[PDB]
Design a protein around this ligand. Structure first.
Ligand SMILES: Cc1cn([C@H]2C[C@H](O)[C@@H](COP(=O)(O)OP(=O)(O)O)O2)c(=O)[nH]c1=O
Ligand SMILES: Cc1cn([C@H]2C[C@H](O)[C@@H](COP(=O)(O)OP(=O)(O)O)O2)c(=O)[nH]c1=O
Lengths: 133, 130
């Protein structure tokens, strides 16, 4: 796989008989400062999300339940990645096009974001994404 | 009670699902320095009760349910968390006991500070004093 700005984070759970606990801290497990946490639930494999990019926004994606595929695209290379467990995090860094699909029904995705929500930061035209690479 | 509030989180719902977002000093009254989550839970194995002096937290039941018994020194309250569009803000100086997790429930915690092993106040009388 040749995509530069992403990384699989095989996170460390602490397990005991009460359950499993995973923790992520700014500039530690997450290579940025958390400004925003959001989560998506009530998902459906017939209803993918839209492809778009961001410029400066970084994220870490954790499948809290169920599964999905993320197609990542750096302008050059693309890679499909299945998220299907809550102890794996997908770092998506700067200048990445991505598209999330095949959510198992009712799957839940947790996202840690480096910056606040801004609809203007979504790049929906692929050619515009290329140009700014 | 005291330093604690049920947050009705606003969700965006469309045919792809529902999204809820929480942002530093907006939905959450602090800078989120840490996020953790607990899963693989079991109604037989409650968490130990304890307090924190300065840590603030927002809890969100991502799946399933649990009971949080809050104690401010004077009073106590049970809160059943059971839906993902509700958060529980737990402010400073609060004793809490989490219990009664439905099997495999999952709880998301947003925290105002980095994890500190010796910031747990695990003795109630000791809590009362300070
Ligand atoms: C990521 C995010 C999305 N949203 C909104 C924008 C959308 O209506 C909805 C779903 O987000 P998203 O699927 O990211 O964008 P779009 O639907 O425009 O492709 O949630 C927020 O309100 N806050 C956020 O932090
Ligand atoms: C909350 C938290 C706990 N942990 C660890 C410490 C504990 O061994 C385990 C469970 O924590 P927790 O239940 O808060 O403490 P205790 O087990 O002492 O009641 O997870 C972290 O590593 N980081 C964290 O942010």
């Amino acid at each position: 796989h040749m995509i530069k700005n992403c990384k699989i984070l095989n996170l460390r759970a602490i397990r005991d008989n009460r359950g499993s606990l995973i923790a992520l801290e700014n500039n530690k497990e997450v290579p940025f400062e958390i400004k925003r946490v959001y989560y998506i639930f009530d998902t459906d494999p017939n209803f993918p999300r839209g492809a778009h990019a961001h410029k400066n926004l970084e994220q870490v994606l954790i499948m809290m339940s169920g599964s999905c595929d993320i197609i990542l695209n750096d302008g050059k290379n693309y890679e499909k990645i299945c998220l299907n467990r809550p102890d794996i995090g997908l770092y998506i860094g700067k200048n990445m096009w991505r598209e999330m699909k095949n959510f198992s029904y009712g799957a839940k995705l947790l996202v840690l974001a480096s910056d606040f929500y801004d609809a203007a930061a979504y790049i929906r035209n692929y050619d515009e994404f290329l140009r700014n690479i």
